[PDB]
């Protein structure tokens, strides 16, 4: 057994040279992740807004969540959330909004 690169990341390379010498073959079967190298799926399900008196109000207690901030704090929150700067979330003018291609080409 011999291999230039370790066979632990996604494929098992086995190189060979044809008896003629003019061709190099390489058999690389894919590598599957063993069961011992994984962890179970975490499941988080909790309903704390449920009330024993009025379930119709309990269902709305979890849906009536609302919040509104200013442009400044909203952009700061978005920047902290997406790990970016504040300058991306500011709008652009008419000159730049009118010159965007309406139907850009698509591949595949």
């Amino acid at each position: 057994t011999y291999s230039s690169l370790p066979d632990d990341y996604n494929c098992k390379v086995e190189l060979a040279l044809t008896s003629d010498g003019r061709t190099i073959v390489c058999y690389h079967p894919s590598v599957d992740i063993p069961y011992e190298h994984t962890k179970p799926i975490p499941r988080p399900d909790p309903v704390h807004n449920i009330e024993e008196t009025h379930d119709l109000v309990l269902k709305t207690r979890l849906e009536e969540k609302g919040e509104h901030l200013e442009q400044g704090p909203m952009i700061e929150q978005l920047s902290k959330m997406f790990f970016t700067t504040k300058h991306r979330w500011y709008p652009r003018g008419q000159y730049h909004r009118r010159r965007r291609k309406p139907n850009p080409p698509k591949d595949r």
Binding site: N10, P34, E36, H37, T38, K106, D107, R108
Partner: protein, 148 residues
């Protein structure tokens, strides 16, 4: 200029040439004159090489219209519905033949800047690279500084 003009990707009409090749040139309408000195090349082409072209390409309908015109034209209509109007004003018979052969070989798509000189549907044979394709899995799927 690429930034001034439009662009498109390398595509084919109805997956042409995959199952069978279908000539995209549907019809070819020549409009020329019988007495104008500018339609002389078109007249000689209609006399000599329009029948040979019609026989070589039986899938294109050729119309010929002698009319009192000053600029002889050729209108190619393709299977996608594209209309390409060219002027054969004051051109030799060889030039007419070359223009008609180019129009017959063309596919009718827009002649604009092609972004990629290739077009692959699903080029991810055997897989596509993601940041996890070359990383080893640990015993238990533990993070670097995670204690089990």
């Amino acid at each position: 200029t690429a930034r001034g003009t439009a662009s498109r990707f390398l595509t084919s009409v109805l997956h042409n040439g995959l199952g069978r090749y279908v000539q995209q040139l549907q019809r070819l309408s020549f409009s020329l004159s019988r007495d104008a000195p500018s339609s002389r090349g078109a007249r000689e082409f209609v006399e000599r090489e329009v029948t040979d072209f019609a026989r070589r390409n039986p899938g294109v309908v050729i119309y010929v219209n002698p009319r009192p015109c000053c600029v002889p034209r050729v209108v190619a209509e393709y299977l996608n519905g594209a209309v390409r109007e060219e002027s054969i004003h004051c051109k030799s018979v060889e030039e007419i033949a070359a223009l008609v052969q180019k129009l017959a070989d063309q596919s009718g798509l827009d002649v604009i800047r092609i972004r990629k000189p290739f077009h692959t549907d699903s080029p991810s044979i055997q897989g596509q690279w993601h940041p996890f394709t070359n990383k080893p899995t640990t015993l238990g799927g533990l993070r670097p500084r995670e204690v089990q």
